[PDB]
Amino acid sequence: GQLSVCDSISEWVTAADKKTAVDMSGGTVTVLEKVPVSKGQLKQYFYETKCNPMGYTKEGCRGIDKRHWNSQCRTTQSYVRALTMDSKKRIGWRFIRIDTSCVCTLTIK
Amino acid sequence: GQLSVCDSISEWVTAADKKTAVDMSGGTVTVLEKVPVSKGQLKQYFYETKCNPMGYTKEGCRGIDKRHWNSQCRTTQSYVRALTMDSKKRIGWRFIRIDTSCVCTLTIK
Amino acid sequence: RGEVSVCDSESLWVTDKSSAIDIRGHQVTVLGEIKTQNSPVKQYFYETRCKEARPVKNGCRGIDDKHWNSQCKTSQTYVRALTSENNKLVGWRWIRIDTSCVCALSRK
Amino acid sequence: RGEVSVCDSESLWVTDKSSAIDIRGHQVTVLGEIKTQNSPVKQYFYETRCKEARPVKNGCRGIDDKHWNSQCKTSQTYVRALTSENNKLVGWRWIRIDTSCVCALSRK
Numbered sequence: 326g327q328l329s330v331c332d333s334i335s336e337w338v339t340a341a342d343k344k345t346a347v348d349m350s351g352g353t354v355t356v357l358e359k360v361p362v363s364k365g366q367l368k369q370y371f372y373e374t375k376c377n378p379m380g381y382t383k384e385g386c387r388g389i390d391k392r393h394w395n396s397q398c399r400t401t402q403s404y405v406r407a408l409t410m411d412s413k414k415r416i417g418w419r420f421i422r423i424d425t426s427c428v429c430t431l432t433i434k
Numbered sequence: 435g436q437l438s439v440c441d442s443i444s445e446w447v448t449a450a451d452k453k454t455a456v457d458m459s460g461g462t463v464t465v466l467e468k469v470p471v472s473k474g475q476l477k478q479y480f481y482e483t484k485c486n487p488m489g490y491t492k493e494g495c496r497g498i499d500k501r502h503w504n505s506q507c508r509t510t511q512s513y514v515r516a517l518t519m520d521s522k523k524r525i526g527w528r529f530i531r532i533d534t535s536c537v538c539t540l541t542i543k
Numbered sequence: 544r545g546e547v548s549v550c551d552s553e554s555l556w557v558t559d560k561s562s563a564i565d566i567r568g569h570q571v572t573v574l575g576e577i578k579t580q581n582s583p584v585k586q587y588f589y590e591t592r593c594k595e596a597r598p599v600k601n602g603c604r605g606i607d608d609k610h611w612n613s614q615c616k617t618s619q620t621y622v623r624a625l626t627s628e629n630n631k632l633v634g635w636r637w638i639r640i641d642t643s644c645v646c647a648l649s650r651k
Numbered sequence: 652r653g654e655v656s657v658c659d660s661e662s663l664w665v666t667d668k669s670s671a672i673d674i675r676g677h678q679v680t681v682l683g684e685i686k687t688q689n690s691p692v693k694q695y696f697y698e699t700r701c702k703e704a705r706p707v708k709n710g711c712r713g714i715d716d717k718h719w720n721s722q723c724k725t726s727q728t729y730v731r732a733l734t735s736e737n738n739k740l741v742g743w744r745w746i747r748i749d750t751s752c753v754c755a756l757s758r759k
Contacts, residue, residue: 326757328757359524361580372728396657428751428753535620538605
Protein backbone atom coordinates (compact mmCIF):
# COMPACT_ATOMS: atom_id res chain seq x y z
CA GLY A 326 0.00 0.00 0.00
CA GLN A 327 0.76 3.76 0.11
CA LEU A 328 1.63 6.30 2.80
CA SER A 329 1.18 10.07 3.09
CA VAL A 330 4.18 12.42 2.82
CA CYS A 331 2.52 14.39 5.65
CA ASP A 332 0.47 13.12 8.56
CA SER A 333 -3.05 14.53 8.79
CA ILE A 334 -6.21 14.13 10.90
CA SER A 335 -9.80 14.94 10.00
CA GLU A 336 -12.61 16.07 12.28
CA TRP A 337 -16.29 17.17 12.19
CA VAL A 338 -16.44 20.73 13.54
CA THR A 339 -19.69 22.46 14.31
CA ALA A 340 -20.27 26.11 13.93
CA ALA A 341 -20.73 25.95 17.68
CA ASP A 342 -17.11 24.88 18.28
CA LYS A 343 -15.94 27.28 15.56
CA LYS A 344 -17.77 30.60 16.27
CA THR A 345 -15.90 32.88 13.85
CA ALA A 346 -14.15 32.54 10.52
CA VAL A 347 -12.62 34.68 7.76
CA ASP A 348 -14.43 35.09 4.50
CA MET A 349 -13.04 35.31 0.99
CA SER A 350 -12.80 39.05 1.59
CA GLY A 351 -10.70 39.19 4.74
CA GLY A 352 -13.55 39.85 7.07
CA THR A 353 -14.16 38.04 10.36
CA VAL A 354 -17.64 36.51 10.25
CA THR A 355 -19.76 34.65 12.82
CA VAL A 356 -20.84 31.22 11.67
CA LEU A 357 -24.52 30.54 12.57
CA GLU A 358 -25.28 27.23 14.40
CA LYS A 359 -28.46 26.30 12.55
CA VAL A 360 -29.81 27.12 9.09
CA PRO A 361 -33.53 27.34 8.26
CA VAL A 362 -34.47 24.82 5.57
CA SER A 363 -37.86 23.52 4.31
CA LYS A 364 -38.89 21.28 7.23
CA GLY A 365 -36.94 22.82 10.04
CA GLN A 366 -33.45 23.62 11.11
CA LEU A 367 -30.12 22.12 10.05
CA LYS A 368 -27.20 22.07 12.47
CA GLN A 369 -24.27 23.70 10.56
CA TYR A 370 -21.06 21.77 10.57
CA PHE A 371 -17.82 21.21 8.63
CA TYR A 372 -15.38 18.42 7.82
CA GLU A 373 -11.85 19.61 8.47
CA THR A 374 -8.50 18.08 7.85
CA LYS A 375 -5.22 19.43 9.18
CA CYS A 376 -1.60 18.46 9.83
CA ASN A 377 -1.60 16.01 12.68
CA PRO A 378 0.30 17.95 15.41
CA MET A 379 1.32 14.61 16.96
CA GLY A 380 2.09 12.73 13.76
CA TYR A 381 5.50 11.44 12.71
CA THR A 382 5.81 14.27 10.20
CA LYS A 383 6.04 17.02 12.88
CA GLU A 384 9.58 18.23 11.96
CA GLY A 385 9.85 17.53 8.23
CA CYS A 386 8.00 15.49 5.62
CA ARG A 387 8.42 11.78 4.88
CA GLY A 388 10.56 10.61 1.91
CA ILE A 389 12.56 13.88 1.55
CA ASP A 390 15.98 14.06 -0.11
CA LYS A 391 17.45 15.73 3.00
CA ARG A 392 20.62 16.45 1.02
CA HIS A 393 19.15 19.22 -1.14
CA TRP A 394 16.07 19.87 0.90
CA ASN A 395 14.52 21.33 3.97
CA SER A 396 10.85 20.41 4.28
CA GLN A 397 7.77 20.97 6.36
CA CYS A 398 4.13 19.94 6.65
CA ARG A 399 1.62 22.66 6.77
CA THR A 400 -2.15 22.89 6.92
CA THR A 401 -3.66 24.53 3.84
CA GLN A 402 -7.18 25.98 3.66
CA SER A 403 -10.07 25.94 1.23
CA TYR A 404 -13.32 27.95 0.69
CA VAL A 405 -16.69 26.48 1.85
CA ARG A 406 -20.07 28.21 1.75
CA ALA A 407 -21.66 28.84 5.14
CA LEU A 408 -24.62 30.84 6.50
CA THR A 409 -22.89 33.55 8.40
CA MET A 410 -23.40 37.02 9.78
CA ASP A 411 -20.88 39.81 9.34
CA SER A 412 -19.69 42.78 11.45
CA LYS A 413 -22.56 44.95 10.25
CA LYS A 414 -24.85 42.14 11.50
CA ARG A 415 -25.90 41.02 8.01
CA ILE A 416 -26.84 37.41 7.48
CA GLY A 417 -25.91 35.62 4.35
CA TRP A 418 -24.15 32.79 2.57
CA ARG A 419 -20.43 33.46 2.28
CA PHE A 420 -17.25 31.53 1.48
CA ILE A 421 -15.15 31.07 4.56
CA ARG A 422 -11.81 29.41 4.91
CA ILE A 423 -11.51 26.05 6.59
CA ASP A 424 -8.57 23.65 6.93
CA THR A 425 -8.82 20.89 4.32
CA SER A 426 -5.30 19.51 4.00
CA CYS A 427 -1.74 19.03 5.24
CA VAL A 428 0.81 19.50 2.41
CA CYS A 429 4.55 19.34 2.17
CA THR A 430 6.67 22.37 1.40
CA LEU A 431 10.39 22.34 0.43
CA THR A 432 13.01 25.13 0.64
CA ILE A 433 16.42 24.74 -1.07
CA LYS A 434 18.98 24.13 1.68
CA GLY B 435 -59.37 69.80 23.35
CA GLN B 436 -58.79 66.50 25.23
CA LEU B 437 -56.23 65.17 27.70
CA SER B 438 -55.01 61.66 28.56
CA VAL B 439 -55.98 60.02 31.87
CA CYS B 440 -52.38 58.73 31.96
CA ASP B 441 -49.22 60.39 30.70
CA SER B 442 -47.30 58.42 28.09
CA ILE B 443 -44.22 58.80 25.85
CA SER B 444 -43.39 57.02 22.61
CA GLU B 445 -39.99 56.10 21.22
CA TRP B 446 -38.35 54.29 18.26
CA VAL B 447 -36.35 51.37 19.68
CA THR B 448 -33.98 49.33 17.59
CA ALA B 449 -33.33 45.71 18.08
CA ALA B 450 -29.83 46.92 18.87
CA ASP B 451 -30.99 48.85 21.96
CA LYS B 452 -33.39 46.03 22.83
CA LYS B 453 -31.33 42.78 22.48
CA THR B 454 -33.77 40.31 24.04
CA ALA B 455 -37.51 39.95 24.38
CA VAL B 456 -40.14 37.43 25.48
CA ASP B 457 -42.22 35.65 22.92
CA MET B 458 -45.87 34.65 23.05
CA SER B 459 -44.65 31.42 24.62
CA GLY B 460 -42.68 32.70 27.59
CA GLY B 461 -39.31 32.22 26.04
CA THR B 462 -36.51 34.80 26.03
CA VAL B 463 -35.52 35.46 22.42
CA THR B 464 -32.75 37.55 20.81
CA VAL B 465 -34.04 40.15 18.40
CA LEU B 466 -31.89 40.29 15.21
CA GLU B 467 -30.64 43.77 14.12
CA LYS B 468 -31.18 43.40 10.39
CA VAL B 469 -33.55 41.28 8.29
CA PRO B 470 -32.73 40.06 4.76
CA VAL B 471 -35.27 41.36 2.24
CA SER B 472 -35.28 41.47 -1.60
CA LYS B 473 -32.72 44.24 -2.23
CA GLY B 474 -30.70 44.09 0.92
CA GLN B 475 -31.00 44.40 4.63
CA LEU B 476 -33.60 46.16 6.77
CA LYS B 477 -32.65 47.57 10.17
CA GLN B 478 -35.20 46.07 12.64
CA TYR B 479 -36.90 48.52 14.90
CA PHE B 480 -40.06 49.11 16.97
CA TYR B 481 -42.34 51.95 17.99
CA GLU B 482 -42.95 51.78 21.73
CA THR B 483 -45.18 53.70 24.02
CA LYS B 484 -45.05 53.54 27.81
CA CYS B 485 -46.14 55.40 30.95
CA ASN B 486 -44.11 58.56 31.13
CA PRO B 487 -42.05 58.00 34.34
CA MET B 488 -41.78 61.79 34.73
CA GLY B 489 -45.33 62.70 33.76
CA TYR B 490 -47.92 64.28 36.04
CA THR B 491 -49.69 60.94 36.36
CA LYS B 492 -46.83 59.26 38.32
CA GLU B 493 -48.83 58.59 41.54
CA GLY B 494 -52.41 58.14 40.32
CA CYS B 495 -54.40 58.83 37.16
CA ARG B 496 -56.01 62.14 36.13
CA GLY B 497 -59.76 62.74 36.69
CA ILE B 498 -60.22 60.01 39.36
CA ASP B 499 -63.05 60.04 41.91
CA LYS B 500 -60.52 59.75 44.77
CA ARG B 501 -63.43 59.13 47.16
CA HIS B 502 -64.17 55.59 45.99
CA TRP B 503 -60.98 54.98 44.13
CA ASN B 504 -57.31 54.26 44.23
CA SER B 505 -55.73 54.45 40.78
CA GLN B 506 -52.52 53.94 38.91
CA CYS B 507 -50.99 54.23 35.44
CA ARG B 508 -49.30 51.22 34.10
CA THR B 509 -47.59 50.27 30.87
CA THR B 510 -49.38 47.48 29.00
CA GLN B 511 -47.81 45.35 26.26
CA SER B 512 -48.80 44.03 22.86
CA TYR B 513 -47.55 41.32 20.41
CA VAL B 514 -45.45 42.35 17.35
CA ARG B 515 -43.81 40.01 14.84
CA ALA B 516 -40.02 40.15 14.76
CA LEU B 517 -37.19 38.10 13.20
CA THR B 518 -35.64 36.54 16.21
CA MET B 519 -33.48 33.65 17.30
CA ASP B 520 -34.32 31.44 20.27
CA SER B 521 -32.31 29.59 22.95
CA LYS B 522 -31.76 26.62 20.66
CA LYS B 523 -30.30 29.13 18.18
CA ARG B 524 -33.22 28.87 15.72
CA ILE B 525 -34.06 31.86 13.58
CA GLY B 526 -37.59 32.74 12.81
CA TRP B 527 -40.48 35.17 12.90
CA ARG B 528 -42.10 35.23 16.33
CA PHE B 529 -44.51 37.44 18.30
CA ILE B 530 -42.71 39.26 21.04
CA ARG B 531 -44.10 41.60 23.62
CA ILE B 532 -43.42 45.30 23.40
CA ASP B 533 -44.82 48.24 25.39
CA THR B 534 -47.60 49.93 23.44
CA SER B 535 -49.61 51.84 26.03
CA CYS B 536 -50.05 53.41 29.47
CA VAL B 537 -53.50 52.63 30.94
CA CYS B 538 -55.28 53.48 34.13
CA THR B 539 -56.20 50.86 36.71
CA LEU B 540 -58.57 51.36 39.69
CA THR B 541 -58.87 49.39 42.96
CA ILE B 542 -61.86 49.93 45.30
CA LYS B 543 -60.58 51.88 48.30
CA ARG C 544 -59.38 40.41 43.04
CA GLY C 545 -60.52 44.04 43.34
CA GLU C 546 -58.99 45.69 40.27
CA VAL C 547 -61.14 47.42 37.69
CA SER C 548 -60.13 49.32 34.49
CA VAL C 549 -61.35 52.75 33.53
CA CYS C 550 -62.22 51.21 30.10
CA ASP C 551 -62.65 47.65 28.93
CA SER C 552 -61.10 46.14 25.85
CA GLU C 553 -60.79 43.06 23.61
CA SER C 554 -57.70 41.63 21.88
CA LEU C 555 -57.91 39.54 18.72
CA TRP C 556 -55.69 38.23 15.94
CA VAL C 557 -56.58 40.03 12.73
CA THR C 558 -55.95 37.79 9.73
CA ASP C 559 -57.60 39.47 6.73
CA LYS C 560 -56.38 43.09 6.91
CA SER C 561 -56.11 44.47 3.38
CA SER C 562 -56.07 48.25 3.91
CA ALA C 563 -54.46 50.65 6.49
CA ILE C 564 -53.21 54.19 7.08
CA ASP C 565 -49.48 54.59 7.00
CA ILE C 566 -47.17 56.99 8.82
CA ARG C 567 -47.48 59.53 6.01
CA GLY C 568 -51.25 59.45 6.07
CA HIS C 569 -51.88 57.42 2.95
CA GLN C 570 -54.18 54.53 2.42
CA VAL C 571 -52.03 51.50 1.52
CA THR C 572 -52.88 47.82 0.83
CA VAL C 573 -51.64 45.28 3.40
CA LEU C 574 -50.45 42.17 1.57
CA GLY C 575 -51.65 38.83 2.84
CA GLU C 576 -48.31 37.17 2.90
CA ILE C 577 -44.58 37.54 3.33
CA LYS C 578 -43.31 35.23 0.57
CA THR C 579 -39.53 35.64 0.91
CA GLN C 580 -37.34 33.18 2.89
CA ASN C 581 -39.61 30.96 0.75
CA SER C 582 -42.04 29.65 3.29
CA PRO C 583 -44.36 31.63 2.67
CA VAL C 584 -45.75 32.97 6.00
CA LYS C 585 -49.12 34.76 6.29
CA GLN C 586 -49.21 38.32 7.64
CA TYR C 587 -51.44 38.89 10.71
CA PHE C 588 -51.64 41.40 13.57
CA TYR C 589 -52.45 41.29 17.25
CA GLU C 590 -55.01 44.03 17.71
CA THR C 591 -56.80 45.48 20.72
CA ARG C 592 -59.58 48.01 20.63
CA CYS C 593 -62.33 49.40 22.98
CA LYS C 594 -65.38 47.15 23.78
CA GLU C 595 -67.31 50.45 23.66
CA ALA C 596 -66.90 54.20 24.34
CA ARG C 597 -68.64 54.14 27.73
CA PRO C 598 -68.44 51.32 30.47
CA VAL C 599 -70.46 53.43 32.84
CA LYS C 600 -72.61 56.00 30.89
CA ASN C 601 -70.97 59.39 32.03
CA GLY C 602 -67.85 58.20 30.00
CA CYS C 603 -65.09 56.00 31.46
CA ARG C 604 -65.23 54.33 34.85
CA GLY C 605 -63.86 55.76 38.09
CA ILE C 606 -63.87 59.35 36.76
CA ASP C 607 -64.98 62.52 38.65
CA ASP C 608 -67.89 63.54 36.40
CA LYS C 609 -68.50 66.22 39.06
CA HIS C 610 -65.81 68.06 37.09
CA TRP C 611 -64.76 65.91 34.04
CA ASN C 612 -65.94 64.55 30.74
CA SER C 613 -64.56 61.29 29.57
CA GLN C 614 -64.84 58.76 26.77
CA CYS C 615 -62.94 55.53 26.06
CA LYS C 616 -61.28 55.86 22.65
CA THR C 617 -59.22 53.14 20.86
CA SER C 618 -55.66 54.39 20.47
CA GLN C 619 -53.21 53.20 17.79
CA THR C 620 -49.53 52.43 17.54
CA TYR C 621 -47.29 51.93 14.45
CA VAL C 622 -46.14 48.55 13.26
CA ARG C 623 -44.18 47.72 10.11
CA ALA C 624 -46.20 45.70 7.53
CA LEU C 625 -45.40 44.63 3.93
CA THR C 626 -47.73 46.79 1.82
CA SER C 627 -48.29 48.21 -1.65
CA GLU C 628 -49.81 51.49 -2.94
CA ASN C 629 -51.97 51.59 -6.12
CA ASN C 630 -50.64 48.10 -6.65
CA LYS C 631 -47.06 49.33 -6.92
CA LEU C 632 -44.12 50.13 -4.70
CA VAL C 633 -44.40 46.96 -2.60
CA GLY C 634 -42.44 47.43 0.62
CA TRP C 635 -42.31 47.67 4.41
CA ARG C 636 -44.22 50.68 5.77
CA TRP C 637 -45.24 51.85 9.24
CA ILE C 638 -49.03 51.48 9.53
CA ARG C 639 -51.49 52.37 12.31
CA ILE C 640 -53.12 49.45 14.16
CA ASP C 641 -55.48 49.61 17.16
CA THR C 642 -53.27 48.80 20.12
CA SER C 643 -55.30 49.72 23.24
CA CYS C 644 -58.35 51.39 24.79
CA VAL C 645 -57.74 54.59 26.60
CA CYS C 646 -59.71 57.21 28.61
CA ALA C 647 -59.88 60.77 27.11
CA LEU C 648 -60.51 63.61 29.56
CA SER C 649 -62.16 66.98 28.79
CA ARG C 650 -62.75 69.96 31.14
CA LYS C 651 -66.08 71.71 31.95
CA ARG D 652 11.43 33.38 -2.57
CA GLY D 653 12.91 29.87 -2.36
CA GLU D 654 9.90 27.70 -1.51
CA VAL D 655 8.84 24.85 -3.74
CA SER D 656 5.97 22.30 -3.32
CA VAL D 657 6.32 18.57 -3.66
CA CYS D 658 3.31 18.75 -6.06
CA ASP D 659 1.70 21.59 -7.94
CA SER D 660 -1.98 22.37 -8.06
CA GLU D 661 -4.74 24.59 -9.49
CA SER D 662 -7.83 26.01 -7.76
CA LEU D 663 -10.99 26.93 -9.65
CA TRP D 664 -14.64 27.75 -9.01
CA VAL D 665 -16.76 24.90 -10.32
CA THR D 666 -20.16 26.17 -11.45
CA ASP D 667 -21.80 23.34 -13.40
CA LYS D 668 -21.38 20.28 -11.13
CA SER D 669 -24.35 17.96 -11.63
CA SER D 670 -23.12 14.63 -10.25
CA ALA D 671 -20.97 13.54 -7.21
CA ILE D 672 -20.22 10.70 -4.80
CA ASP D 673 -21.72 11.08 -1.39
CA ILE D 674 -20.54 9.89 2.03
CA ARG D 675 -22.39 6.60 1.60
CA GLY D 676 -20.82 5.92 -1.76
CA HIS D 677 -23.77 6.69 -3.99
CA GLN D 678 -23.90 8.73 -7.11
CA VAL D 679 -26.20 11.71 -6.44
CA THR D 680 -27.24 14.73 -8.57
CA VAL D 681 -25.98 18.15 -7.40
CA LEU D 682 -28.74 20.71 -7.92
CA GLY D 683 -27.82 23.96 -9.60
CA GLU D 684 -29.46 26.20 -7.12
CA ILE D 685 -30.52 26.76 -3.54
CA LYS D 686 -33.97 28.31 -4.05
CA THR D 687 -35.11 28.82 -0.45
CA GLN D 688 -34.75 32.18 1.40
CA ASN D 689 -36.20 33.10 -2.02
CA SER D 690 -33.22 34.61 -3.75
CA PRO D 691 -32.42 32.09 -5.40
CA VAL D 692 -28.61 31.60 -5.12
CA LYS D 693 -26.61 29.32 -7.46
CA GLN D 694 -24.64 26.42 -5.98
CA TYR D 695 -20.88 26.39 -6.77
CA PHE D 696 -17.74 24.90 -5.21
CA TYR D 697 -14.15 25.99 -4.74
CA GLU D 698 -12.14 23.05 -6.01
CA THR D 699 -8.43 22.27 -6.15
CA ARG D 700 -6.85 19.33 -7.87
CA CYS D 701 -3.36 18.19 -9.10
CA LYS D 702 -1.87 19.89 -12.24
CA GLU D 703 -0.51 16.40 -12.98
CA ALA D 704 0.71 13.21 -11.22
CA ARG D 705 4.41 13.96 -11.66
CA PRO D 706 6.18 17.47 -11.44
CA VAL D 707 9.56 15.83 -11.79
CA LYS D 708 9.22 12.40 -13.55
CA ASN D 709 10.27 9.94 -10.66
CA GLY D 710 6.95 11.07 -8.93
CA CYS D 711 6.68 14.13 -6.68
CA ARG D 712 9.41 16.71 -6.19
CA GLY D 713 12.02 16.68 -3.44
CA ILE D 714 11.59 12.93 -2.78
CA ASP D 715 14.38 10.35 -2.15
CA ASP D 716 13.78 8.09 -5.18
CA LYS D 717 16.95 6.31 -4.00
CA HIS D 718 14.48 4.55 -1.69
CA TRP D 719 10.90 5.82 -2.44
CA ASN D 720 8.16 5.80 -5.02
CA SER D 721 5.87 8.75 -5.19
CA GLN D 722 2.97 10.17 -7.16
CA CYS D 723 0.90 13.33 -6.70
CA LYS D 724 -2.74 12.32 -6.26
CA THR D 725 -5.73 14.71 -5.87
CA SER D 726 -7.26 14.17 -2.45
CA GLN D 727 -10.90 14.95 -1.53
CA THR D 728 -12.77 16.35 1.42
CA TYR D 729 -16.53 16.31 2.23
CA VAL D 730 -18.76 19.31 1.81
CA ARG D 731 -22.54 19.52 2.24
CA ALA D 732 -24.43 20.17 -1.05
CA LEU D 733 -28.18 20.21 -1.87
CA THR D 734 -28.67 17.06 -3.97
CA SER D 735 -31.23 14.55 -5.20
CA GLU D 736 -31.08 10.80 -5.96
CA ASN D 737 -33.01 9.27 -8.91
CA ASN D 738 -34.75 12.62 -8.98
CA LYS D 739 -36.19 12.14 -5.51
CA LEU D 740 -35.24 12.69 -1.90
CA VAL D 741 -33.92 16.22 -2.44
CA GLY D 742 -31.74 17.20 0.53
CA TRP D 743 -28.38 18.18 1.98
CA ARG D 744 -25.77 15.41 1.67
CA TRP D 745 -22.02 15.20 2.29
CA ILE D 746 -20.30 14.84 -1.10
CA ARG D 747 -16.64 14.37 -2.09
CA ILE D 748 -14.94 17.31 -3.83
CA ASP D 749 -11.28 17.61 -4.88
CA THR D 750 -9.71 19.74 -2.18
CA SER D 751 -5.91 19.43 -2.66
CA CYS D 752 -2.96 17.73 -4.34
CA VAL D 753 -0.93 15.46 -2.19
CA CYS D 754 2.21 13.24 -2.46
CA ALA D 755 1.68 9.43 -2.01
CA LEU D 756 4.71 7.43 -0.87
CA SER D 757 5.39 3.73 -1.55
CA ARG D 758 8.34 1.57 -0.36
CA LYS D 759 10.77 -0.49 -2.51
